[PDB]
């Protein structure tokens, strides 16, 4: 609606007979591949993230955000449990960390 | 006939008039044909799987 | 037989343009939509096609009305058959209501 | 022939995700008409002339 991407702001110009506006907008530019997985078994529990998606470089599985690629440490801050490991379809074992 | 075709010469431009807008909303048709369905870049397609 | 409306208007001089984009042309916009939204939630209109597991989108669609992820990923099988079963009362419905 | 566009094809999968890294900042124009021209008409004038 208000340009193309994620709207951040605009600011209006004026023209003879009409209005133009000038669209501030935000978009993602480089991708990358990663491994994910819906969910983590730790000691029989599921754990969710709170607010990203778990992602794998191959070795270790971090936290992050949505639309920024900012790896962290699962721990239970980012985390919440709900249920065990015998629902979810494709849940992977990792060590949740706790400060 | 040509004596009906002179009579509507001497009534001028109304013709003209009505062509320019069906032309008009011929064009508009056009464009509101792309505007809806023309939105994505790339033609993306499934995967096999 | 006889004279019909097509040819009466044609010959009294009034004509029906072809459209610019072909019914063709217009399911392959139809399905390239449809292949982007599935392969790719919603990052395809924002900026580049970042591809996402389907359960995964639809944990997003899940936390974006406000219901957390774990219920969408306890209940997948049960949403699904669903999913399937409202899609075939749609053609059930299109098929035999011409309404 | 119209051509629709590239062909591209989304390398979906059952365990692989695309995050971006990096950014971008637009500014679009977009172009709005407001208001016509307030014209009016002498009727009896254009029709007549006095
Ligand atoms: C994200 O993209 C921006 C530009 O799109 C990158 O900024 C450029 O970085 C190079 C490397 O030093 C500079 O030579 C350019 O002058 C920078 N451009 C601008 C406009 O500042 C940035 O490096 C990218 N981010 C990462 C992590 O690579
Ligand atoms: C990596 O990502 C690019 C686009 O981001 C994609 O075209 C390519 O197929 C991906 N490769 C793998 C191995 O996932
Ligand atoms: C994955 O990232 C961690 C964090 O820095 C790193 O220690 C590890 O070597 C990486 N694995 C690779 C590059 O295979
Ligand atoms: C995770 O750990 C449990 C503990 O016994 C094991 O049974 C299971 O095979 C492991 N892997 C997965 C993918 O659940
Ligand atoms: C995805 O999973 C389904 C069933 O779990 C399997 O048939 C299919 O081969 C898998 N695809 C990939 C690319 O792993």
Redesign the interface.
Known sequence: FC????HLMSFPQS?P???????????????????????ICHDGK?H?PREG?F?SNGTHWFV?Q????EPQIITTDNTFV??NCD????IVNNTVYDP | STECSNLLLQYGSFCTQLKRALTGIAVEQDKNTQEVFAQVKQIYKTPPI | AARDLICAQKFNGLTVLPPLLTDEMIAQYTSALLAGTITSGWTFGAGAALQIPFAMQMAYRFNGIGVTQNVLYENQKLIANQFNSAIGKIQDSLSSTAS | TMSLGAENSVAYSNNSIAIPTNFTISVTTEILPVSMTKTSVDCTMYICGD
């Open positions: 340009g193309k991407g994620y023209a007979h009409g209005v133009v506006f000038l669209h501030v907008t935000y978009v993602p530019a480089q991708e990358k591949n990663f491994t994910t997985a819906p969910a599921a969710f998606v992602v992050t949505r639309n920024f690629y709900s249920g629902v979810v379809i494709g």
